[PDB]
Amino acid sequence: MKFGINLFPTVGPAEKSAGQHFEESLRLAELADELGFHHVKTVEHYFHEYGGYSPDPVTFLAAAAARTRRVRLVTGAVLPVFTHPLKLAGKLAMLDNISQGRLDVGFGRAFLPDEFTAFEISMDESRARFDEGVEAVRRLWAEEDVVWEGTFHRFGPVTMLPRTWQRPHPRILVATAKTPASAEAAARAGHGVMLVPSINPREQVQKTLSLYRDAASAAGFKPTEEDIHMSYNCYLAEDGQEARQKGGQASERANRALASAVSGDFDRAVAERKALVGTPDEVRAAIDDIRGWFGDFTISLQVISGAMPFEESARTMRLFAEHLLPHYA
Amino acid sequence: MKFGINLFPTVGPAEKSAGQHFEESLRLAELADELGFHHVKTVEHYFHEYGGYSPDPVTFLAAAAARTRRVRLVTGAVLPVFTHPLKLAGKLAMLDNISQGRLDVGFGRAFLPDEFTAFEISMDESRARFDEGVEAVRRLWAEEDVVWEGTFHRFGPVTMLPRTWQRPHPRILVATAKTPASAEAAARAGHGVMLVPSINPREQVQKTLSLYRDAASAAGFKPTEEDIHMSYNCYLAEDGQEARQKGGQASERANRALASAVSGDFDRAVAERKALVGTPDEVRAAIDDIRGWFGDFTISLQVISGAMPFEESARTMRLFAEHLLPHYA
Ligand SMILES: [Ca+2]
Ligand SMILES: [Ca+2]
Ligand SMILES: [Ca+2]
Ligand SMILES: [Ca+2]
Ligand SMILES: [Ca+2]
Ligand SMILES: [Ca+2]
């Protein structure tokens, strides 16, 4: 197992200024570095309290990279549908070099209707836009004199600068909450995968992993634990009932932001290992269950939410580092 | 006068790898901070050794912001013609908050044919895309529930997140199109201007400044020296021979890059005060001339070029801070 942190903002200006949010998030990235976490992840979203403080994850991750030395930086996930592959390839290549080779690039599908409407892009061909965006970026990184005759963009021969630091390029992961068939296509392409256990049933995530691992082997490709990412809301306290109360409020706040942006329950989610909330001992048992179902992979611990004090996010990370990180290292 | 540092890359891998360039440029930003320079600036350009290591200046400046405390971060310049105003406003708002209000945003006009070709933008739309892009971004920062229905984009109502740190928005500077209307339009909107003395005759710069200052007065706008930006190649050494030879190589190399991209001169440029290269006493005389011609404004000192070692860029900056910065303070 690998464990990093995810910094998904679910907050609006009435709860926390963006100035405070970004100072706190960069300090949590520093704490991830100091405590020995694997990575720092953030997201791309527009307009709503659900994710909207992060319309450009690369901008945050370049700052996080500059504040850190060893933690990896991960997009979870850039949205190729809303950018141009020349720009996406270029800014990610800059970040790879700034971070001295610590970047992993997750690419995801958009789903918020207001994002599609505002950028005047149809959902109808978003799948083709996504696949062509990923491949065009990969080609801009891997090749020179690139002639891209795409459905949505046509350019070349061109060679994108800067060239990436990593060879052939940063790891590519494809996010799928949608369809196990997209996980098969990722393996066929040699890509990693990002799954969403917090919404999908356990047996569904397992069958997606089985299809992915099967397709990967058929393509002569052995996925490591760094090729499979999943994010979990995470809140730790020495008092597990305090963790339930404050972590449950956080998960509630994020759920509400989500419901607004798309246009008993918490305890069951915790019992089903859809969220990592409790004492270090509760979360240890939960992780061991997850590892038994899914095998070894990379978890991003989502540690911020709403007006949750920085000190509580930092406590979660410190407790995880002291009590859990050593046993999986 | 104010003096900052320009970190425009005119460099390819035979001179510095991208990894070396970004490591050294971030250290120069740290040195600009330490030595008391006003700002750090970088460019947006694609494909060529002329600027092509920086397809996304916000990515670099986010890292530079994270490494520094006081120096301002200036886009010189983002190109609205190649990015959607929603994305431009969002990433810049993130950068504003990450830097805790140290951002000034210069908006530039593209001119390299290869960039227009690759992004599939007709050059005849350059003016409208620029003016509509700048204004849409300004409104996205300044207002809530923004609806924009222009020639190229239609969206809203949206409230762009994160909200900027600076209110109503960061300083906006615009490259002028040498037509009088563009300098007057900047003044009437309360924008600053970015002028190019290294290429245009002194009298042209003076005419644009007169138009800008007069239109500002008529509009009730009082521009300050921080509202007027110009870049100069800069190389200082106490040995005047070394300054001319190495500063000359640096400027000639940058001019070769530009000539490739668009398809006794250096001595003349220095004599006409279009480059700031020489001993500290020689450059002092040059700046005194420029200030007499143009008034007080903000200079970005372009201190890197090609394979010039970091320590020579650092020496230029240290000599400038010791011998010239106090005379204008
Ligand atoms: Ca603080
Ligand atoms: Ca090659
Ligand atoms: Ca080095
Ligand atoms: Ca400039
Ligand atoms: Ca103003
Ligand atoms: Ca300038």
The angle formed by the CA atoms of residues B135, B139 and B145, to the nearest 5 degrees, is 140
Which ligand is closest to the CA of A25, given by its number?
1
- Domain of A52, in residue numbers: 2-327
Taken as a whole, chain A contains a residue count of 329
How far away, in angstroms, is A149 Cα from ligand 3 center? 38
Give the orientation angle of helix A18-35 with respect to helix A310-323, to 10 degrees: 10
SS3 of chain B: the string is: CEEEEECCCECCCCCCCHHHHHHHHHHHHHHHHHHCCCEEEECCCCCCCECCCCCCHHHHHHHHHHHCCCCEEEEEEECHHHCCHHHHHHHHHHHHHHCCCCEEEEECCCCCHHHHHHHCCCHHHHHHHHHHHHHHHHHHHHCCCEEEECCCCEEEEECCCCCCCCCCCCEEEEECCCCHHHHHHHHHHCCEEEECCCCCCHHHHHHHHHHHHHHHHHHCCCCCHHHEEEEEEEEECCCHHHHHHHHHHHHHHHHHHHHHHCCCHHHHHHHCCCCEEECHHHHHHHHHHHHHHHCCCEEEEECCCCCCCHHHHHHHHHHHHHHCHHHHC
Q: CATH code at B134?
A: 3.20.20.30
How far away, in angstroms, is A163 Cα from ligand 2 center? 10
Q: Where are the beta strands (DSSP E) in A92-225?
A: 103-107, 146-149, 154-158, 171-175, 192-195
Q: Quick one: A46 exposed, middle or buried, by C-beta within 10 A (0-12, 13-18, 19+)?
A: buried
- Asked if B210 and B191 touch (Cβ cutoff 8 Å), the reply is no
CA gap B64, B7 in Å, rounded: 11
- Asked if B160 and B93 touch (Cβ cutoff 8 Å), the reply is yes
> Resolution limit in angstroms?
1.6
Tokens found for residue A177: 């909450």
Name residues 36-95 of chain B within 8 A of A (Cβ).
46-48, 52-56, 58-60, 62-67, 82-84, 86-87, 90-91, 93-95
Contact list, A62 vs chain B (CB under 8 Å): 59-60, 62-63, 66
- Asked if B251 and B10 touch (Cβ cutoff 8 Å), the reply is no
- Asked if A140 and A161 touch (Cβ cutoff 8 Å), the reply is no
- Asked if A313 and A304 touch (Cβ cutoff 8 Å), the reply is yes
Which ligand is closest to the CA of B21, given by its number?
3
Contact list, A53 vs chain B (CB under 8 Å): 94, 161-162
Q: Quick one: B268 exposed, middle or buried, by C-beta within 10 A (0-12, 13-18, 19+)?
A: exposed
- CB–CB of A62 and B63 under 8 A? yes
- CB–CB of B118 and A86 under 8 A? yes
- CB–CB of A165 and B18 under 8 A? yes
Handedness of CA B299, B300, B305, B309 (dihedral sign): positive
Give the minimum alpha-carbon distance from A125 to chain B in angstroms, rounded to a whole number.
Answer: 19
Contacts of A163 (CB under 8 A, 6+ apart): A93, A141, B13, B18
- Asked if B314 and B31 touch (Cβ cutoff 8 Å), the reply is yes
Chain B residue with minimal CA distance to A90? B55
CA gap B16, B27 in Å, rounded: 15
Contact list, B119 vs chain A (CB under 8 Å): 84, 86, 155
Give the orientation angle of helix B57-67 with respect to helix B85-98, to 10 degrees: 10
Candidates B87, B143, B260: best to mutate against A (most CBs of A within 10 A) is B87
Contact list, A56 vs chain B (CB under 8 Å): 58, 87, 90-91, 94
- CB–CB of A120 and B155 under 8 A? yes
Tokens found for residue B312: 């020579």
- Count of domains for chain A: 1
The H or E element containing residue A204 is helix A202-218
Exposure on the CB side of residue A188, measured as CA atoms within 13 A: 9
- CB–CB of A158 and B22 under 8 A? no
Chain B residue with minimal CA distance to A63? B63
- CB–CB of B63 and A58 under 8 A? no
Residue B174 β-bridge partners: B107, B193
Contact list, B67 vs chain A (CB under 8 Å): 66
- CB–CB of B97 and A55 under 8 A? no
The amino acid sitting at B36 is G
The angle formed by the CA atoms of residues A87, A88 and A93, to the nearest 5 degrees, is 100
Exposure on the CB side of residue B180, measured as CA atoms within 13 A: 6
- Asked if A57 and A42 touch (Cβ cutoff 8 Å), the reply is yes
